[PDB]
Design a protein around this ligand. Structure first.
Ligand SMILES: *Cc1c(COP(=O)(O)O)cnc(C)c1O
Ligand SMILES: *Cc1c(COP(=O)(O)O)cnc(C)c1O
Lengths: 429, 429
């Protein structure tokens, strides 16, 4: 608690920035970055296996993002989509709609964040249908605004379901059929046509990076469509190439009615999008708008991200580098009993820590200590999960094979030195 | 409705972007910009007296914003304030707190938009106090999200008051004392201590650019403080040098408890801020957070805006160029009877149009036609107001004396040729 520490960048953050928006696990204080590496005020370098919770899709200082943002700042097509059309925003909407199977029928709404986008999707669908009921999952993370929290699991007529977890199956049913049956029984108890939409994550993020059982999401989508319920796929976390296909729903044998994007869409700038049927997004005007929505600098960044996914073959990169990561982690699991489950798709990877592999008892304290030690060793990653025991890895898609190796090595050391981290120091955060 | 028009940038915007977030008055379609001028796809240049609703504080392609954003993109301090401190965000918070009279007691929360910021302020104050009641004004524009609309005038325990307008005074009382008296009588009817906060705009934006009567806001603030009600000053529209003082409340003889900033703070990037007492912003953690909040590119832009306000003496510029604008408009009022009132401070200017100066009957249809004709002539401005009859001028602070002249000349022509605009063409929007 001395003056030198209080005067460093982390101490100044405490004195100037309120705690309201902080989610802090260790005293990471960044002054710069390059590739998949962060540089602290003191000059210390770290590998960022978080990639800013997935937002730094192209890592730090990617030349495509430099080029686009500098170009747009020097010759910006205004500042907004609200009261003018602008070139970069329109080009972006065109590209996003062309990427999606509903390209002939769908349009785009632009926001600043995943929270904003999920709020707008819910508001538009309820307006369009005149119904407010909504299905979502327990543990779902759809945002942290009043409008997006109304159907988060982490609104009038909310039905919340368990998300089927192959490692901890609801009703001991590894197929997830018991969750579908539960949904049917819930729907039987409400008036016909009273549910407007279903929000789903195709890999549950904050819930624990939980890939649902084979077939489950297709079946779920079929139940929704049988009731005329719009299926909204929240791909803020696992979209745009991260899963090893461009859209994560490509792994799951269905196409949603509405696709929600964010995080890495902006490559480190604030950008989100909803791709929805024209009838949904055209049901009102001047209805869900913020002044800087569709600003050209952020639109330019989104174009750069899409262009770079193509130019650097990042779908295939994510699939290759995800296999490499998972190989490394499987080697770690030979040596460290704490590792209970390694899961995910592409470069959305979760590692669940347990005190015993038979019982699967969660290792909550151990996880928090692990990530603190990793920070000390020069690797940044966080945890998530209902039980606080799932390491989250969402590195930049451009992270090199060498940086994947180094991160795995640093993680190996963290696991070895877990214990060394004091309870008091960790409970500060 | 032919293919060439449908294939131009405005037509493509209609086919790809939903109407949900649009607020369109004429078919403005922008491909670039420089200074205070926009360039359409077809190459036509326009003077932007809107400045993107106030957001383009430094105009288009300002070198300070180019330099900052390019620098931060090339060496970004991560992407977020949530799970790391970062250098530009901390420096920004420091500068914002130093600018405010509550510098010893206050901290900062960062958002993407004015809507986000107003939502966060309301959530924090209600959490901190355990009270949800709130005072706001009829006609108030605090945002367009579920959380910011809950106390907009354009929440449980909402008291809404008339905003005192010198041109149309409530109860024929030009001082606004009747509105204060009404407030006292409303407060007498609620339980002691049940109102947490009062949101006010120091010039009402969407309401009609309405500068309140001398003394009113100081008196209002005193009533609030007598009841322990936190005073929140929403300066999203008229803050940061636009009024000819750095903070608009400087004209009004009070200091708020909480200051909300947005729009031009980012100079065309999405950035907002709340400056509030530490006890308010420290009352929770992980409570009001979005992944890209405090990202360094947007923080860098905000630093550039603050630095440029200083380096280019933009407070004094706004006061000088606002006098020049108001002189020009006063000349227009000699010739065009429609002009009923010219008001505002600095470069936040409103011109209210009336069918007759004695009766003050609003000229709603005429206003819409006027701005459409102006667009055709090469000037961009919009209207606002309860009666749809207030031209809004919020140009970039860097707009030159020559561009002010040209805009006034183009407006003179618009007024002359109002009639020429067809009802059908204008009612399309
Ligand atoms: C991150 C995330 C959001 C929210 O995005 P923000 O930018 O934090 O508002 C929504 N949905 C999912 C699945 C997410 O991972
Ligand atoms: C523009 C404005 C807002 C909302 O800002 P957005 O960026 O559109 O969310 C809030 N308050 C006032 C006074 C405004 O002018």
């Amino acid at each position: 608690q001395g003056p030198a520490m209080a005067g460093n960048l982390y101490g100044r953050d405490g004195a100037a920035i309120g705690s309201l928006q902080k989610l802090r696990f260790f005293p990471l204080a960044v002054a710069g970055g390059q590739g998949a590496r962060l540089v602290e005020e003191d000059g210390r370098e770290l590998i960022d296996l978080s990639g800013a919770w997935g937002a730094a899709s192209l890592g730090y200082g990617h030349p495509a993002i430099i080029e686009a943002v500098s170009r747009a700042a020097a010759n910006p097509a205004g500042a907004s989509i609200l009261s003018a059309s602008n070139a970069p925003a329109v080009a972006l909407a065109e590209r996003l709609t062309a990427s999606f199977p509903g390209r002939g029928t769908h349009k785009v709404w632009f926001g600043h964040s995943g929270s904003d986008a999920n709020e707008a999707a819910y508001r538009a669908i309820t307006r369009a249908t005149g119904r407010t009921g909504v299905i979502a999952f327990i543990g779902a993370y759809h945002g942290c605004t009043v409008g997006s929290m109304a159907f988060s699991g982490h609104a009038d007529g909310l039905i919340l379901l368990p998300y089927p977890d192959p490692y901890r199956p609801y009703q001991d049913d590894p197929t997830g059929d018991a969750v579908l049956a539960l949904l049917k029984e819930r729907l039987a108890a409400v008036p016909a046509g009273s549910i407007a939409a279903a929000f789903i994550e195709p890999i549950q993020s904050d819930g624990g990076l939980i890939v649902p059982p084979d077939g489950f999401l297709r079946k779920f989508a079929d139940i929704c469509r049988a009731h005329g319920i719009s299926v909204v796929c929240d791909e803020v976390k696992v979209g745009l190439a991260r899963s090893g296909r461009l859209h994560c729903f490509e792994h799951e044998g269905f196409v949603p009615d509405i696709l929600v994007l964010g995080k890495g869409l902006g490559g480190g700038l604030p950008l989100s999008a909803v791709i929805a049927p024209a009838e949904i997004l055209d049901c009102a005007s001047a209805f869900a708008m913020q002044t800087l929505h569709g600003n050209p600098v952020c639109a330019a960044a989104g174009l750069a991200v899409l262009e770079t996914i193509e130019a650097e073959n990042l779908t295939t990169a994510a699939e290759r580098k995800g296999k490499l990561l998972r190989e490394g982690l499987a080697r770690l699991a030979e040596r460290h009993e704490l590792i209970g489950d390694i899961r995910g798709r592409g470069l959305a990877c979760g590692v669940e820590l347990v005190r015993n592999r038979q019982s699967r008892e969660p290792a909550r304290a151990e996880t928090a200590k692990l990530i603190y030690r990793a920070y000390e060793l020069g690797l940044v990653l966080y945890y998530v999960g209902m039980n606080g025991n799932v390491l989250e890895m969402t590195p930049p898609l451009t992270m090199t094979e060498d940086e994947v190796r180094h991160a795995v090595n640093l993680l190996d050391q963290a696991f070895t030195e877990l214990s060394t981290v004091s309870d008091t120091l960790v409970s500060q955060f």
